[PDB]
Design a protein around this ligand. Structure first.
Ligand SMILES: Nc1ncnc2c1ncn2[C@@H]1O[C@H](COP(=O)(O)OP(=O)(O)OP(=O)(O)O)[C@@H](O)[C@H]1O
Ligand SMILES: Nc1ncnc2c1ncn2[C@@H]1O[C@H](COP(=O)(O)OP(=O)(O)OP(=O)(O)O)[C@@H](O)[C@H]1O
Ligand SMILES: Nc1ncnc2c1ncn2[C@@H]1O[C@H](COP(=O)(O)OP(=O)(O)OP(=O)(O)O)[C@@H](O)[C@H]1O
Ligand SMILES: [Mg+2]
Ligand SMILES: [Mg+2]
Ligand SMILES: [Mg+2]
Ligand SMILES: [Zn+2]
Ligand SMILES: [Zn+2]
Lengths: 260, 161, 260, 260
């Protein structure tokens, strides 16, 4: 049982990807923009679940490699770090395609990145946290989207929109967006029920997501998927730590008052 | 541990040239390098082509004995004995005696030797298939004619009885 | 029994040639380049297994003893020294052949290597670690390829790609290129399940690339076939030395800890 | 007891090798990699070890020399000088095995050192202070490890890690590692006692891991064993210089003031 308890707590620590209508809409729109090389910019709140949806769109087109040619990765996902320069960005592009860099000037990195980009036949350039990179690199990404014809999706918080708004070309060229919703409603109840079924993976004690539980979770998460994940995982781990097989009212109240 | 080298035991009747060549190839040395190590200078590079204008002296052989770790008398036993005349050119080879043991016999270079006493074969002065003269014995990395890549042991059945 | 154990660990510690799909497609590519006599350049990231594939290729087409003429050698495999001049390249290419040249000068050596190349009618020249060569030597390599019509296969890592991109006339003839495979995807399953008994040759614990074993391997090798090779062999040595029947989880986690 | 005084000072000036947990761990790890013939990289911190233990390991497997044959030394320990070239590495290898050639072309010298490594039956090549050689020599080291199946142990500080991480192939050759720690905690409580009874071997002061001296010892040595050696040996020297039978805390404070 102790080994089973350790397995349960380790699984609860690990986050999962339940496919729901938000990620469904996102990757449907992503496929639509991919089929026409339309460079858009998906936007949304913080801790809402855009990156996970992007991740899923990245893994679904798992690259299929030929016997003796470079693999065809159709979707490229990068998450440049804070104040990411152009050399760093090109390094990331060529590193994702599994092409280790060689020391040189920025021009050398740009040329190698262009070469590996055309050779691999990439279709998508997903730049999450696109509010981090410097504006001297937005010209580079503009040229990438222009000459190489790769649809770029600038992903980030609403601060990304402010970052690109002060610029001239990047705002006009990247205008199509997909704002992430709050999810509050009956769809939220469906979400929490589905999370109970799959993510929690607890024995069926007929919790059924009662009205009091729904009110507590609504007051806690405020519609955030990440908040819901964190609170559910914390409640499950706290119940399993005190020997409680299922999740009762006290742990929900404790985590809710701890968070707010 | 004690200072060492890739020692080679001398054959029976091998040449000084061939023995020094085997010693060099097993130590990755050079004629100038072997001479400098021995302390006698480029004289070694001369011996590999049998130019014994000043016969290999007792001192010039003791200095070698110090390096190749072969007794000086055993060294003199690959030079022609005092008074015996050898021809430094052409380099001569018996195929059968090479098949028996892969070496170059100093006795083949004697002016008075034309027949292999233990094979009754007229020894070869040039490659029997392409008429290419043989190299210096020290230059025999392996037993083959340089121009035609024919093994030395093969030539035994081309050389006349 | 310790003699049998020592023989087994001697087999493990020894590098063994093992058949993959990538080596077979490389052999097909190189046969095509032979029949075309067209220059190529196989490139791949480190430890991906280019050297062993080229060695297996050159063993496949072993040289034949010719009776009328000196023997013809189909392929020449040379691994030069770091920052070695063209003189040393000529020395190595002659020494690989039965021929041998001493004394002389660079022009004499180049003439001699031209003659020995035309005499043997060598088809391909697989230079391993091509980037070890000085840039001036690349002009000589071009001259050899152009004058003798010999397909030169430049084997190396992406540093070779950068080096050939540095100069124009060197890269001029090497239009084609074969990119080696990282082996990511489902191919990992086949390669691990084959390597379990093809190479290790011990009574298997029916691991069959189990979930725990496969995930611990992907956490250490990342598709590097050499990585999994030496990891599995060293782990088998550890398991057999301590008296265990077959490998377990503890030794794999220890070797993964010492690797990552 | 003046003559007795320089007798004690002559005894103390030498560097006795205390046995310790770290040296045994390194010995066992090195033995395992040697039987596996696997190249490893002992990354460590300065003054912590990697020299006394590594050198002791060569003493463990004492070379045997026949009167008129090449010796068989299983472990070859060298310490390259600053910015040592390939000829310097080859000459260190050649001179360690007491070969009797010392001049020649660098290519010929490479061939000679390969032949001595093959002939002397060497299996482990310890390169202490591997932070003192160019990457070209690293390439030569890679060639040595590949051709001769040698377990090459790279010894140095983390600057060694920085130096080898800039080259693709050197990183993959030596992923295996072993960090030397600082033993911050329980180990000093016995290390001080061992150092006081054996290498000191002076009249016992009943020190017995007293917290009074333990505090100043921790504040001075900070956890580096070589620092402890210097401090304790100098303290004993000063104690006998003034003739004190025991090592008083006053001299400990004096040597601490000298060091910091
Ligand atoms: N489809 C999903 N299935 C399961 N969990 C999800 C999903 N989408 C998001 N999450 C959860 O959301 C949290 C993190 O969301 P994510 O990192 O995708 O946010 P984001 O919208 O990109 O915003 P941020 O910029 O604040 O990181 C995690 O707890 C993760 O489990
Ligand atoms: N086809 C193969 N079969 C068996 N082992 C292989 C194969 N390819 C590579 N290896 C293993 O990889 C290691 C050597 O790989 P190899 O040198 O061929 O790779 P490489 O990508 O050319 O890299 P490098 O240039 O850095 O040497 C050894 O451990 C060897 O066992
Ligand atoms: N295991 C040990 N037993 C006894 N003394 C030791 C031991 N290890 C180190 N020392 C002491 O440390 C000093 C030398 O340190 P050492 O040469 O081991 O350092 P290192 O870590 O190899 O150095 P570097 O800073 O060059 O990496 C000497 O005073 C020696 O007595
Ligand atoms: Mg996010
Ligand atoms: Mg290789
Ligand atoms: Mg040191
Ligand atoms: Zn004969
Ligand atoms: Zn001939």
């Amino acid at each position: 049982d102790d080994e089973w308890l350790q397995a349960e707590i380790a699984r609860l620590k690990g986050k999962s990807i339940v496919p729901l209508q938000q990620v469904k809409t996102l990757h449907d729109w992503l496929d639509g923009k991919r089929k026409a090389r339309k460079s858009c910019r998906v936007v949304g709140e913080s801790r809402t679940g855009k990156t996970v949806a992007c991740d899923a769109y990245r893994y679904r087109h798992k690259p299929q490699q030929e016997a003796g040619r470079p693999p065809t990765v159709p979707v490229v996902y990068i998450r440049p770090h804070q104040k990411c320069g152009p050399k760093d960005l090109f390094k990331k592009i060529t590193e994702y395609l599994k092409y280790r860099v060689t020391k040189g000037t920025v021009s050398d990195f740009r040329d190698r990145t262009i070469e590996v980009l055309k050779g691999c036949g990439v279709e998508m350039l997903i730049i999450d946290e696109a509010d981090r990179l410097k504006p001297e690199t937005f010209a580079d990404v503009r040229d990438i989207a222009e000459d190489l014809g790769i649809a770029v999706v600038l992903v980030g918080t609403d601060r990304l929109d402010a970052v690109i708004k002060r610029d001239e070309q990047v705002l006009e060229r990247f205008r199509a967006h997909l704002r992430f919703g709050k999810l509050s409603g009956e769809d939220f109840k469906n979400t929490v029920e589905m999370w109970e079924q799959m993510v929690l993976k607890l024995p069926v004690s007929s919790n059924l997501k009662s009205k009091e539980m729904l009110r507590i979770l609504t007051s806690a998460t405020e519609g955030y998927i990440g908040r819901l994940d964190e609170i559910l995982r914390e409640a499950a781990i706290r119940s399993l730590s005190r020997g409680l097989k299922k999740i009762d009212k006290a742990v929900l109240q404790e985590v809710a008052k701890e968070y707010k | 541990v004690k200072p060492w080298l890739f020692l080679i035991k001398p054959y029976e009747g091998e040449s000084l040239s061939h023995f020094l060549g085997r010693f060099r190839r097993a130590n990755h040395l050079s004629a100038s390098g072997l001479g400098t190590l021995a302390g006698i200078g480029a004289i070694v590079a001369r011996w590999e082509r049998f130019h014994f204008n000043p016969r290999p002296s007792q001192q010039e052989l003791e200095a070698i004995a110090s390096v190749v770790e072969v007794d000086a008398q055993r060294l003199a036993q690959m030079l022609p004995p005092a008074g015996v005349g050898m021809q430094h050119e052409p380099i001569r080879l018996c195929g059968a005696c090479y098949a028996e043991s892969p070496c170059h016999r100093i006795e083949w270079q004697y002016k008075s030797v034309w027949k292999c006493d233990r094979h009754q074969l007229k020894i070869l002065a040039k490659c029997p298939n392409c008429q290419a003269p043989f190299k210096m014995p020290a230059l025999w990395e392996d037993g083959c004619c340089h121009r035609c890549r024919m093994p030395f042991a093969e030539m035994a059945k081309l050389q006349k009885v």
